[PDB]
Design a protein around this ligand. Structure first.
Ligand SMILES: C[C@@H]1CC[C@@]2(OC1)O[C@H]1[C@@H](O)[C@H]3[C@@H]4CC[C@H]5C[C@@H](O[C@@H]6O[C@H](CO)[C@H](O[C@@H]7O[C@H](CO)[C@@H](O)[C@H](O[C@@H]8OC[C@@H](O)[C@H](O)[C@H]8O)[C@H]7O[C@@H]7O[C@H](CO)[C@H](O)[C@H](O[C@@H]8O[C@H](CO)[C@@H](O)[C@H](O)[C@H]8O)[C@H]7O)[C@H](O)[C@H]6O)[C@H](O)C[C@]5(C)[C@H]4CC[C@]3(C)[C@H]1[C@@H]2C
Ligand SMILES: *[C@@H]1O[C@H](CO)[C@@H](O[C@@H]2O[C@H](CO)[C@@H](O)[C@H](O)[C@H]2NC(C)=O)[C@H](O)[C@H]1NC(C)=O
Ligand SMILES: *[C@@H]1O[C@H](CO)[C@@H](O[C@@H]2O[C@H](CO)[C@@H](O)[C@H](O)[C@H]2NC(C)=O)[C@H](O)[C@H]1NC(C)=O
Ligand SMILES: *[C@@H]1O[C@H](CO)[C@@H](O[C@@H]2O[C@H](CO)[C@@H](O)[C@H](O)[C@H]2NC(C)=O)[C@H](O)[C@H]1NC(C)=O
Ligand SMILES: *[C@@H]1O[C@H](CO)[C@@H](O[C@@H]2O[C@H](CO)[C@@H](O)[C@H](O)[C@H]2NC(C)=O)[C@H](O)[C@H]1NC(C)=O
Lengths: 469, 457
């Protein structure tokens, strides 16, 4: 408590201090304006961030194809009102669509006795379909109907005169669309003359109702220029085909197949579906399904899947099953023909328990698509590698930047790092930690060096590295 | 009266803790069903803690706060550490967090989808600080006429969230993340992360460890005070638990763990007249938490320089416009030293860990006072069922927050070990060489020349 007093201090207040205080008091207002001018000069020196591309509802997730309602649930529960017991399962896949099969009336190849304006009674009714749409909007899942009128015969477009196939469609594109359906589907347009003007008069009216509607057109071609003859005017149509379904079995082919397809059309939005309406167990052999799920969930576009592709629903591994619509194996009792034929590795609940299964990989990947920003609408750049490896980087402007490298070859490859295709913003760091691998041999979340990457045959990687500041 | 003494407990527990806690109690709780239990439990576990501090504060009718209560129960060592931590850590980082949530609520309307320039953040907390110091170092009448407009800023922000959540439940849905259809617990937590939600959900409940003994000496409600804190703190949990409801009826929890400023993304996803109402009236609320927590520190320097310590260079008064000029500069320098961190949610965990280190000791001092030295005349006596459930809630909240990240909680037990050499040479030392004492005499007197301050009478 050794201080000076008050009255002892005011005598000791010297004129040498009143200059010392007023100079130091002025230093604060200089040091504060020297920190306010330094902040506004760095809020404009800092680089801005890019605007959002203002996506629609089909830019997320993966559209789900459902061909035959009777083969989906099975016998007895094959009605359309029994589908609401499955929307609790489709939202477990986080699937943002539902391509529904043709539910209209045609007997067999009859041009006169058909109508796309009412529902056939073998599945439900009008009051049954609107009961389905109460739960579709309830769980954030949109539905799409298949408009193929002759979906029983070989020629799916009524090989007589072409007037009646264009006048009742425009009734169905208005009457069903007033009910609240979210888009329309039409397929097999190789059996359709002047179809590019047939779709354009349907694409104009589908977006003419609301902007968030869309049309899914499907050929069965594999030609680069045949589909550009269809996409020459409709640059907002989601065109599926069989373009990626060639023989191939080399890494440099599909690398050249998807770089040339994008670069010819630019960077527009596409649909990375492998087929028109068929399953992945007919164009692939056995141990390649676990690799294409990584490949179709990372290319820029909306992947389109049919029912059963998340588990490996095969028709060649079971005789006595129709190719047009095989049944869906929910349990051991879903296939009641032969007891003990199906086993624990082709069922729903068995695959939903094994974390290294195929249905576990489809649920692990779609969550990394419907929540990201780099895989949603990022940028696609490929690497000019050596042997049959497909690798590419995906990046938005300042979010976490995703990397994918996968081995199409049947031998053990090396890393083979190839930069200098990318700008200086997107460079490869030394360290990048894993997030998901197809063949489980490592620990998730264990980082490793890029130049010491040794890949096993028929496996893929999903690597994440942050914005390297 | 009763309501106006209930209104100055609700009216100051409410602060700028609700604008950065839902980003932190949602990530560490995994899901949103567990992130509303933590907002309910810590409201209930604090009315245990506020019922207990009323009991110790009525049998020891002293002034100063928790520093006055450890000295009369524990020794001179453990009493000094409460003054020594609350002048070094818990005050310089209860205004280094409420200064860093001012920069993030003014850059986020300009940098929506890109995380902001990191070295331009700290130059917006060293302007909110250095302007509010000079205002608090001027006349004391200035430090209250603008404080009650930073209640008007805070109340307009919180009344607008409390109303726009009523509309979204009447125009939109009913309880969208409920355990019937939605709300899967997809990232289920365990031992470590479910206890780190009670260390960021207890930052918005600061303001009762001293802020109840300043109530009885204005109108003297005569022992209605434990009946005045049964209707106050559930009126501040119901405001807090309905604001976090009003966020998830307007955005997704993939986005609530993405954005740095929580109330400004809720403000822009509802209304067309934006960016002059929501990021304005929250940057006006975190001014009244960096102003109200500077002149709160002045009544700790005064009561700390009485008994044995906190020497007479501090606790002085400007001869006109009486404000403690050499005392406010001790926090304003030590806050700017605590702005070198590269985050904010690692400073909420640093405060809340040692804030619970003294919420357990000064409640365990009751149990010692209830066992040793009983039979004191006591006006209000509470059950023993209450301070035993706090001692177990304090038990698993420290041994689980030390097994996870033992670095930000590992130096909170290393500051308080520096005070044991400090309480070896303050009042425990012989003045034989007489050399070190006269330098303490020296810088004290020249500070009376640098600023004109004197001692009180
Ligand atoms: C005058 C007085 C003096 C006393 C005082 O007052 C004034 O001074 C004040 C001031 O001085 C304060 C300090 C300021 C600085 C603060 C820093 C802060 O973070 C710490 O930052 C350190 C930086 O050196 C360490 O971080 C590691 O630093 C190493 C270098 O030293 C890196 O090597 C390592 O990263 C590793 O690098 C190699 C990669 O291959 C690895 O993959 C990666 O892990 C980092 O570790 C990372 O540190 C980050 C912060 O920088 C995160 O903590 C992160 O977290 C983890 O991230 C993983 C990502 O996969 C995730 O899975 C996991 O769950 C997360 O936990 C963690 O990896 C440390 O460890 C981390 O703690 C800490 O908290 C509190 C802190 C010290 C403060 C405590 C309180 C103080 C002393 C105050 C105190 C009162
Ligand atoms: C849909 O409606 C028509 C059908 O293509 C087009 O809109 C315009 O229609 C007029 C007809 O008089 C043409 O002259 C214009 O060229 C059309 N717009 C164009 C091509 O720019 C168009 O296809 C769709 N509507 C709009 C406005 O794009
Ligand atoms: C689509 O699939 C069919 C059946 O495999 C391919 O065969 C053609 O079918 C059409 C009628 O459906 C015939 O007019 C063609 O002559 C068939 N082609 C051959 C090779 O005989 C058809 O080629 C496929 N479409 C494309 C574009 O390849
Ligand atoms: C796809 O990309 C390639 C390479 O960027 C394009 O090839 C370029 O074509 C132009 C026009 O002839 C040449 O001037 C360039 O020199 C070519 N590239 C280089 C660098 O050699 C190609 O045109 C793009 N798409 C296509 C095939 O049209
Ligand atoms: C379920 O999975 C197991 C293991 O992958 C299969 O067992 C193997 O099946 C292949 C098929 O060619 C045989 O070559 C192996 O010899 C089998 N291994 C053993 C140890 O039996 C099993 O076949 C699968 N289930 C079904 C019905 O195919």
């Amino acid at each position: 408590t050794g201080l000076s007093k008050e009255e002892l201090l005011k005598v000791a207040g010297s004129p040498g201090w009143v200059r010392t205080r007023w100079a130091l008091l002025l230093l604060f207002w200089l040091g504060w304006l020297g920190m306010l001018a330094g902040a506004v000069v760095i809020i404009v020196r800092a680089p801005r961030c890019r605007e959002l591309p203002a996506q629609k509802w089909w830019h997320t997730g993966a559209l789900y194809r459902i061909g035959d309602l009777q083969a989906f649930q099975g016998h007895g529960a094959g009605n359309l009102a029994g589908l609401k017991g499955r929307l609790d399962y489709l939202s477990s896949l986080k699937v943002k669509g539902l391509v529904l099969g043709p539910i209209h009336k045609n007997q067999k190849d009859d041009v006169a006795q058909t109508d796309l304006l009412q529902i056939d009674p073998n599945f439900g009714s009008k009051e049954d379909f609107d009961s389905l749409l109460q739960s579709a909007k309830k769980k954030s899942i949109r539905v799409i109907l298949d408009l193929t009128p002759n979906y029983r015969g070989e020629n799916s477009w009524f090989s007589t005169q072409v007037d009646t196939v264009a006048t009742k469609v425009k009734d169905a594109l208005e009457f069903w669309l007033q009910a609240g359906v979210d888009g329309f589907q039409v397929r097999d347009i190789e059996n359709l003359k002047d179809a590019s003007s047939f779709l354009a008069e349907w694409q104009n009216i589908t977006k003419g109702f609301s902007e968030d509607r869309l049309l899914i057109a499907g050929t069965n071609s594999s030609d680069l220029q045949q589909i550009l003859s269809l996409l020459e005017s409709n640059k907002d149509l989601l065109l599926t085909s069989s373009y990626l379904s060639d023989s191939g079995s080399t890494g440099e082919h599909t690398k050249s197949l998807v770089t040339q397809y994008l670069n010819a059309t630019g960077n527009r939005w596409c649909s990375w579906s492998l087929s028109q309406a068929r399953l992945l167990t007919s164009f692939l052999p056995a141990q390649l399904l676990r690799l294409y799920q990584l490949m179709l969930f990372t290319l820029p576009g909306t992947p389109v899947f049919s029912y059963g592709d998340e588990i490996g629903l095969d028709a060649a591994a079971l005789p006595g099953q129709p190719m047009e619509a095989p049944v869906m194996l929910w349990d051991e009792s879903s296939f009641p023909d032969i007891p003990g034929a199906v086993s624990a590795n082709m069922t729903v609940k068995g695959q939903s328990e094994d974390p290294g299964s195929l249905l576990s990989l489809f649920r692990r990947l779609s969550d990394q698509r419907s929540k990201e920003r780099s895989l949603l609408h990022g940028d696609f750049h490929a690497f000019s590698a050596g042997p049959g490896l497909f690798s590419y980087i995906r990046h938005w402007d300042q979010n976490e930047r995703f990397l994918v490298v996968l081995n199409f070859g049947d031998v053990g490859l090396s890393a083979g790092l190839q930069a200098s295709d990318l700008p200086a913003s997107a460079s490869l760091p030394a360290k990048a930690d894993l997030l998901l691998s197809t063949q489980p041999g490592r620990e998730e979340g264990s980082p490793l060096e890029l130049e010491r990457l040794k890949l096993e045959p028929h496996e893929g990687l999903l690597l994440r590295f942050p914005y390297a500041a | 009266g009763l309501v106006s003494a209930c209104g100055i407990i609700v009216g100051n527990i409410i602060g700028s803790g609700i604008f950065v806690s839902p980003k932190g109690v949602l990530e560490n709780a995994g899901s949103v069903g567990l992130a509303l239990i933590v907002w309910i439990v810590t409201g209930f576990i604090t009315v245990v803690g506020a019922l207990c501090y009323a009991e110790l504060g009525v049998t020891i009718p002293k002034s100063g706060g928790d520093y006055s209560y450890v000295k009369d129960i524990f020794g001179g060592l453990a009493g000094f550490l409460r003054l020594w931590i609350a002048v070094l850590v818990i005050y310089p980082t209860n205004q280094a967090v409420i200064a860093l949530t001012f920069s993030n609520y003014v850059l986020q309307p300009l940098f929506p989808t890109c995380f902001p320039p990191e070295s331009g953040l700290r130059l917006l907390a060293a302007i909110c600080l250095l302007l509010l110091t000079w205002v608090n170092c001027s006349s004391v009448r200035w430090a209250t006429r603008v404080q009650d407009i930073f209640t008007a800023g805070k109340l307009l922000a919180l009344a607008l969230i409390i109303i726009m959540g009523i509309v979204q439940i009447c125009k939109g849905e009913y309880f969208w993340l409920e355990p019937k259809n939605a709300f899967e617990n997809f990232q289920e937590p365990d031992i470590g992360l479910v206890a780190l939600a009670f260390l960021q959900g207890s930052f918005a409940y600061g303001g009762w460890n001293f802020l109840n003994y300043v109530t009885e000496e204005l109108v003297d409600p005569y022992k209605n005070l434990p009946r005045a804190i049964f209707i106050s703190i559930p009126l501040v949990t119901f405001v807090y638990v309905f604001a976090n409801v009003a966020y998830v009826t307007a955005m997704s929890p993939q986005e609530l763990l993405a954005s740095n400023a929580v109330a400004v993304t809720f403000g822009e996803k509802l209304l067309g007249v934006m960016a002059w109402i929501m990021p304005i009236s929250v940057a006006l609320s975190t001014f009244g938490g960096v102003n109200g927590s500077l002149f709160t520190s002045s009544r700790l320097f005064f009561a700390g320089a009485r008994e044995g310590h906190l020497p007479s260079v501090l606790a002085m008064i400007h001869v006109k416009r009486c404000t403690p000029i050499p005392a406010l500069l001790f926090t304003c320098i030590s806050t700017l030293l605590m702005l070198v961190t590269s985050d904010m949610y690692t400073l909420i965990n640093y405060v809340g860990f040692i804030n619970y280190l003294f919420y357990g000791v000064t409640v365990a001092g009751q149990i010692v006072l209830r066992w040793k030295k009983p039979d004191i005349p006591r006006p209000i006596k509470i059950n023993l069922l209450f301070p035993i459930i706090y001692l177990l809630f304090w038990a698993f909240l420290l041994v689980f927050s030390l097994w996870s990240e033992p670095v930000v909680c590992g130096i909170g037990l290393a500051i308080m070990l520096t005070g044991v050499p400090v309480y070896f040479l303050g009042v425990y030392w012989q003045h034989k060489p007489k050399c070190f004492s006269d330098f303490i005499e020296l810088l004290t007197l020249v500070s009376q020349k640098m600023c004109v301050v004197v001692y009180p009478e």
